Amino acid sequence: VFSGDGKDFYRLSGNVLSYTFQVKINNDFNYEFYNSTWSYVKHTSTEHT
Amino acid sequence: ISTIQPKANFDAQQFAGTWLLVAVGSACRFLQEQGHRAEATTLHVAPQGTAMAVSTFRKLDGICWQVRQLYGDTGVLGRFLLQARDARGAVHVVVAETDYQSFAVLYLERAGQLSVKLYARSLPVSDSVLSGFEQRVQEAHLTEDQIFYFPKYGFCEAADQFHVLDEV
């Protein structure tokens, strides 16, 4: 067989029913992101004369 | 076996700098059986005498490399011996057809076998130059199928220290 990948000829045994040289590449990506931020202020005063 | 004439009044002070490899004419079984996954390749040249001072730049498996060499001259202008730096011994080396503006053709020989190389000084090459090089391949007594054509892209220069061979 001539492999269309790695670009070479190869020999096969009578033990293998089929050696194919198809290519498939299947990719799945998941990227998930969070960010959060807070700020707070309180003040009081109580006064006399 | 017979020897071609070198470039008459050649000058390494004027033939200098980069030369991008287009192709190589050789009978060698390595390029017939191993030759797949070939590498982007270029010559680089400077004056030091009648002898050329030289580097080859090349990628190896995606890492860039440099082959430093001195083309020690035969006593004939444009003919050199490759300084026999390893147990393979000498290589006879020649510059045979060129214009320093656009193209160079070199002959290289060892163990009675001729081989030839085509370079252009920039990315493109003229079909007239390529046709002339095939006549130099046929003058090396090789077929156009013994021409192997190298990567027309991804060339390298200025590799790091541990990727220069220091062969001299």
Side-chain angles (χ1 to χ4, degrees), chain B residues 67-70 82-83 85-86 88 164-168:
Chain B
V67 186
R68 283 177 68 175
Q69 302 184 306
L70 299 181
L82 203 66
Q83 209 184 28
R85 294 288 82 189
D86 196 11
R88 287 174 303 297
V164 61
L165 288 179
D166 198 29
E167 171 168 293
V168 180

PDB file of all heavy atoms in Angstrom, chain B residues 67-70 82-83 85-86 88 164-168:
ATOM      1  N   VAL B  67      25.248  24.412   8.783  1.00  0.00           N
ATOM      2  CA  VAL B  67      26.419  23.604   8.410  1.00  0.00           C
ATOM      3  C   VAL B  67      27.543  24.540   7.932  1.00  0.00           C
ATOM      4  O   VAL B  67      27.564  24.913   6.762  1.00  0.00           O
ATOM      5  CB  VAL B  67      26.063  22.589   7.295  1.00  0.00           C
ATOM      6  CG1 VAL B  67      27.240  21.648   7.028  1.00  0.00           C
ATOM      7  CG2 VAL B  67      24.813  21.751   7.562  1.00  0.00           C
ATOM      8  N   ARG B  68      28.461  24.965   8.811  1.00  0.00           N
ATOM      9  CA  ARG B  68      29.652  25.762   8.436  1.00  0.00           C
ATOM     10  C   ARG B  68      30.670  24.902   7.695  1.00  0.00           C
ATOM     11  O   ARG B  68      31.029  23.852   8.209  1.00  0.00           O
ATOM     12  CB  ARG B  68      30.304  26.371   9.688  1.00  0.00           C
ATOM     13  CG  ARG B  68      29.528  27.592  10.189  1.00  0.00           C
ATOM     14  CD  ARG B  68      30.100  28.178  11.484  1.00  0.00           C
ATOM     15  NE  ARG B  68      31.426  28.792  11.287  1.00  0.00           N
ATOM     16  CZ  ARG B  68      32.123  29.462  12.188  1.00  0.00           C
ATOM     17  NH1 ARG B  68      31.698  29.647  13.404  1.00  0.00           N
ATOM     18  NH2 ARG B  68      33.275  29.977  11.875  1.00  0.00           N
ATOM     19  N   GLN B  69      31.193  25.341   6.556  1.00  0.00           N
ATOM     20  CA  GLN B  69      32.205  24.619   5.766  1.00  0.00           C
ATOM     21  C   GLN B  69      33.207  25.572   5.073  1.00  0.00           C
ATOM     22  O   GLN B  69      32.854  26.697   4.724  1.00  0.00           O
ATOM     23  CB  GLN B  69      31.523  23.746   4.698  1.00  0.00           C
ATOM     24  CG  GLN B  69      30.544  22.716   5.268  1.00  0.00           C
ATOM     25  CD  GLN B  69      29.958  21.818   4.184  1.00  0.00           C
ATOM     26  OE1 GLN B  69      29.404  22.281   3.199  1.00  0.00           O
ATOM     27  NE2 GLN B  69      30.032  20.513   4.315  1.00  0.00           N
ATOM     28  N   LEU B  70      34.443  25.128   4.809  1.00  0.00           N
ATOM     29  CA  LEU B  70      35.392  25.834   3.927  1.00  0.00           C
ATOM     30  C   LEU B  70      35.664  25.028   2.657  1.00  0.00           C
ATOM     31  O   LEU B  70      36.100  23.879   2.705  1.00  0.00           O
ATOM     32  CB  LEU B  70      36.705  26.162   4.654  1.00  0.00           C
ATOM     33  CG  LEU B  70      36.555  27.072   5.882  1.00  0.00           C
ATOM     34  CD1 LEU B  70      37.936  27.323   6.486  1.00  0.00           C
ATOM     35  CD2 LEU B  70      35.937  28.429   5.544  1.00  0.00           C
ATOM     36  N   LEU B  82      36.135  20.325  -0.561  1.00  0.00           N
ATOM     37  CA  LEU B  82      35.321  20.261   0.666  1.00  0.00           C
ATOM     38  C   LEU B  82      36.100  19.929   1.964  1.00  0.00           C
ATOM     39  O   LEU B  82      35.511  19.607   2.992  1.00  0.00           O
ATOM     40  CB  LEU B  82      34.085  19.376   0.402  1.00  0.00           C
ATOM     41  CG  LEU B  82      32.877  19.619   1.332  1.00  0.00           C
ATOM     42  CD1 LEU B  82      32.253  21.000   1.126  1.00  0.00           C
ATOM     43  CD2 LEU B  82      31.796  18.574   1.061  1.00  0.00           C
ATOM     44  N   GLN B  83      37.434  20.016   1.941  1.00  0.00           N
ATOM     45  CA  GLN B  83      38.336  19.859   3.094  1.00  0.00           C
ATOM     46  C   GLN B  83      38.243  18.503   3.827  1.00  0.00           C
ATOM     47  O   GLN B  83      38.737  18.383   4.942  1.00  0.00           O
ATOM     48  CB  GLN B  83      38.226  21.084   4.033  1.00  0.00           C
ATOM     49  CG  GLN B  83      39.512  21.380   4.820  1.00  0.00           C
ATOM     50  CD  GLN B  83      39.397  22.515   5.829  1.00  0.00           C
ATOM     51  OE1 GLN B  83      38.351  22.829   6.374  1.00  0.00           O
ATOM     52  NE2 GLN B  83      40.483  23.167   6.139  1.00  0.00           N
ATOM     53  N   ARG B  85      36.480  16.604   5.775  1.00  0.00           N
ATOM     54  CA  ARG B  85      36.316  16.800   7.236  1.00  0.00           C
ATOM     55  C   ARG B  85      35.789  15.578   7.999  1.00  0.00           C
ATOM     56  O   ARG B  85      35.702  15.607   9.226  1.00  0.00           O
ATOM     57  CB  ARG B  85      35.396  18.006   7.511  1.00  0.00           C
ATOM     58  CG  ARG B  85      35.919  19.389   7.094  1.00  0.00           C
ATOM     59  CD  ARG B  85      37.045  19.920   7.982  1.00  0.00           C
ATOM     60  NE  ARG B  85      38.355  19.371   7.615  1.00  0.00           N
ATOM     61  CZ  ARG B  85      39.477  19.494   8.285  1.00  0.00           C
ATOM     62  NH1 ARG B  85      39.544  20.089   9.429  1.00  0.00           N
ATOM     63  NH2 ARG B  85      40.567  19.016   7.793  1.00  0.00           N
ATOM     64  N   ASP B  86      35.452  14.496   7.303  1.00  0.00           N
ATOM     65  CA  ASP B  86      34.928  13.250   7.872  1.00  0.00           C
ATOM     66  C   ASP B  86      35.355  12.036   7.023  1.00  0.00           C
ATOM     67  O   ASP B  86      35.852  12.197   5.911  1.00  0.00           O
ATOM     68  CB  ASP B  86      33.396  13.366   7.995  1.00  0.00           C
ATOM     69  CG  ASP B  86      32.760  12.311   8.910  1.00  0.00           C
ATOM     70  OD1 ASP B  86      33.497  11.597   9.623  1.00  0.00           O
ATOM     71  OD2 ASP B  86      31.511  12.195   8.890  1.00  0.00           O
ATOM     72  N   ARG B  88      34.085   9.929   5.035  1.00  0.00           N
ATOM     73  CA  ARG B  88      33.681   9.922   3.613  1.00  0.00           C
ATOM     74  C   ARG B  88      34.743  10.543   2.701  1.00  0.00           C
ATOM     75  O   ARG B  88      34.747  10.299   1.498  1.00  0.00           O
ATOM     76  CB  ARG B  88      32.334  10.647   3.442  1.00  0.00           C
ATOM     77  CG  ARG B  88      31.168   9.802   3.984  1.00  0.00           C
ATOM     78  CD  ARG B  88      29.815  10.537   3.969  1.00  0.00           C
ATOM     79  NE  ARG B  88      29.833  11.802   4.738  1.00  0.00           N
ATOM     80  CZ  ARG B  88      30.044  11.941   6.033  1.00  0.00           C
ATOM     81  NH1 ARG B  88      30.164  10.934   6.843  1.00  0.00           N
ATOM     82  NH2 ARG B  88      30.187  13.116   6.564  1.00  0.00           N
ATOM     83  N   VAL B 164      24.606  25.165  15.133  1.00  0.00           N
ATOM     84  CA  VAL B 164      25.675  25.211  14.117  1.00  0.00           C
ATOM     85  C   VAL B 164      26.703  24.085  14.312  1.00  0.00           C
ATOM     86  O   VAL B 164      27.216  23.889  15.412  1.00  0.00           O
ATOM     87  CB  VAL B 164      26.276  26.622  13.959  1.00  0.00           C
ATOM     88  CG1 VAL B 164      26.945  27.215  15.199  1.00  0.00           C
ATOM     89  CG2 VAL B 164      27.302  26.646  12.824  1.00  0.00           C
ATOM     90  N   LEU B 165      26.999  23.315  13.254  1.00  0.00           N
ATOM     91  CA  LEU B 165      27.860  22.117  13.342  1.00  0.00           C
ATOM     92  C   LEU B 165      29.364  22.383  13.575  1.00  0.00           C
ATOM     93  O   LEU B 165      30.054  21.503  14.088  1.00  0.00           O
ATOM     94  CB  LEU B 165      27.710  21.258  12.068  1.00  0.00           C
ATOM     95  CG  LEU B 165      26.393  20.485  11.908  1.00  0.00           C
ATOM     96  CD1 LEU B 165      26.428  19.726  10.586  1.00  0.00           C
ATOM     97  CD2 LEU B 165      26.178  19.427  12.990  1.00  0.00           C
ATOM     98  N   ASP B 166      29.886  23.555  13.190  1.00  0.00           N
ATOM     99  CA  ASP B 166      31.313  23.913  13.303  1.00  0.00           C
ATOM    100  C   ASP B 166      32.241  22.918  12.562  1.00  0.00           C
ATOM    101  O   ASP B 166      33.306  22.542  13.047  1.00  0.00           O
ATOM    102  CB  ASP B 166      31.681  24.158  14.779  1.00  0.00           C
ATOM    103  CG  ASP B 166      32.984  24.930  14.989  1.00  0.00           C
ATOM    104  OD1 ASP B 166      33.351  25.741  14.132  1.00  0.00           O
ATOM    105  OD2 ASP B 166      33.608  24.773  16.054  1.00  0.00           O
ATOM    106  N   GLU B 167      31.812  22.430  11.391  1.00  0.00           N
ATOM    107  CA  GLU B 167      32.567  21.454  10.593  1.00  0.00           C
ATOM    108  C   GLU B 167      33.814  22.065   9.926  1.00  0.00           C
ATOM    109  O   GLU B 167      34.854  21.409   9.859  1.00  0.00           O
ATOM    110  CB  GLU B 167      31.616  20.794   9.579  1.00  0.00           C
ATOM    111  CG  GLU B 167      32.345  19.927   8.545  1.00  0.00           C
ATOM    112  CD  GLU B 167      31.373  19.059   7.741  1.00  0.00           C
ATOM    113  OE1 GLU B 167      30.753  18.148   8.332  1.00  0.00           O
ATOM    114  OE2 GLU B 167      31.247  19.276   6.516  1.00  0.00           O
ATOM    115  N   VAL B 168      33.745  23.326   9.475  1.00  0.00           N
ATOM    116  CA  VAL B 168      34.883  24.068   8.893  1.00  0.00           C
ATOM    117  C   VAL B 168      35.569  23.275   7.777  1.00  0.00           C
ATOM    118  O   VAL B 168      34.940  22.958   6.774  1.00  0.00           O
ATOM    119  CB  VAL B 168      35.871  24.530   9.983  1.00  0.00           C
ATOM    120  CG1 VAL B 168      37.061  25.291   9.406  1.00  0.00           C
ATOM    121  CG2 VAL B 168      35.188  25.462  10.988  1.00  0.00           C
TER     122      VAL B 168
END
